[PDB]
Design a protein around this ligand. Structure first.
Ligand SMILES: [Mg+2]
Length: 417
């Protein structure tokens, strides 16, 4: 109450939170950037406590004045991510695949950071109001066909199949005594594995899952970070995969997991492992960074530096490897297939004039619609940016269309456009 709490600002210097000395010599917290990165910045209140960065870095911010925290976020990329989600429910994460730095992290619906108290009040009055939910880091989603990046990468790494391997792609087929179906039950005839990735065929990926088997599929997902607790300053639930033991018992569950749908029956007493895959948007961005960065996932980070009131520097982020998902050769082969998705497949809306874009579209099944996903990277040959976006209950392909705008803004900011 008595001393100046430190500021929180973006990497390009937009102040998200600061303390100003009042009339009576007291200090009050100000949030002068409207709804820019609201969920990330969080709030600090003697009534409501803390959340976001205000919570995670409370000790350094509190402090003699407290220390100033500089985030990795770029305000223009952050705004583009928020604009992509405007009027929708969902989330968007933009990362630098070479460092793990988070350039944008947005959730929708959102709110003005300054108005956190009123928003908390509304949440209490209406348990259905989900504005305060951190969807980018804090929520698990079914990734749907975006997860095929993991299945494909695993199949190539383990030599289960190659890009040229041919699979039947019927509209529906029985696997493990129930049905796996292509989107809209489309019959594509025989497809190479590359073509099946371009068209996003569930029946091909289901068969590929059964062929590789539960042990390999689960190990492959774990190589990309599933079932690992990943350290992060904001609450991030562990992304989940079933045990190999559970998937072994149901070829149908295995086939759907390979296609990104978590169909494991968790209503069944006695089930030992979770349904999966279930992932955060951050995790799906990390999957993208593995493909972009020669197979290596860098540790995601949000704080670039901390500086004292003196101006001196007490913390500087050091980009660091988290895990090697696949080999450099495998990553490159997958990246080439994902370029095909955008050039010739379901991802054409992600194309950007003058820069090659590679990525994977996703549809995740819901009762009366779908969640719409895109994970992609640009420039395709040596990416400088990765974007993951989910639009809940979205029109077909909307995730890809919105990702285009976010990627374009990132490339403009970086000078490539
Ligand atoms: Mg074969």
């Amino acid at each position: 109450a008595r001393s100046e709490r430190g500021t929180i600002a973006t990497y390009d210097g937009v102040v998200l939170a600061r303390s100003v000395k009042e009339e009576d010599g007291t200090y009050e917290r100000e949030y002068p950037a409207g709804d820019l990165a609201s969920h990330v910045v969080g709030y600090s209140s003697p009534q409501f406590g803390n959340s976001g960065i205000e919570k995670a870095y409370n000790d350094t911010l509190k402090g003699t004045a407290g220390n100033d925290v500089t985030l990795t976020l770029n305000s223009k990329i952050q705004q583009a991510a928020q604009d992509a989600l405007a009027g929708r429910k969902g989330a968007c994460v933009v990362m630098d695949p070479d460092t793990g730095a988070i350039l944008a992290m947005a959730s929708a619906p959102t709110y003005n950071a300054a108005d956190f108290a009123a928003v908390i009040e509304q949440a209490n009055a209406n348990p259905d109001d989900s504005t305060l939910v951190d969807r980018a880091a804090g929520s698990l989603y079914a990734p749907g066909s975006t997860f095929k990046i993991v299945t494909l990468a695993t199949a190539l790494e383990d030599d289960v199949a190659g890009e040229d391997t041919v699979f039947s792609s019927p509209g529906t087929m029985e696997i493990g005594n129930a049905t796996v179906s292509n989107f809209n039950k489309a019959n594509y005839g025989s497809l190479t594995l590359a073509q099946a990735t371009e068209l996003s065929s569930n029946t091909v990926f289901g068969q590929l899952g059964v062929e590789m088997g539960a042990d390999k599929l689960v190990a492959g997902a774990e190589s990309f970070g599933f079932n690992k607790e990943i350290d992060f300053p904001l609450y991030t639930p562990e992304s989940l995969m079933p045990s190999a033991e559970d998937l072994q018992k149901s070829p149908w569950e295995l086939a759907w997991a390979a296609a990104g749908e978590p169909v494991g029956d968790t209503t069944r007493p006695g089930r030992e492992s979770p349904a999966g895959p279930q992932a955060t948007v951050l995790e799906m961005a990390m999957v993208g960074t593995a493909i972009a960065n020669d197979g290596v996932i860098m540790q995601p980070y949000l704080v670039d530096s901390v500086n004292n009131a003196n101006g001196e520097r007490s913390f500087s982020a050091s980009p660091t490897k988290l895990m090697q998902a696949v080999s450099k050769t495998t990553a490159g082969r997958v990246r080439d297939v994902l370029l095909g998705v955008v050039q010739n497949g379901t991802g054409t809306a992600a194309a950007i004039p003058g820069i090659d874009v590679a990525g994977k579209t996703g549809t995740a099944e819901k009762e009366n619609g779908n969640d719409s996903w895109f994970v992609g990277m640009a420039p395709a040959e040596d990416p400088r940016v990765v974007v993951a976006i989910v639009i809940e209950d979205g029109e077909e392909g909307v995730g890809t269309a919105k990702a285009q705008n976010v990627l374009k803004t990132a490339l403009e900011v970086q000078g490539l456009l």
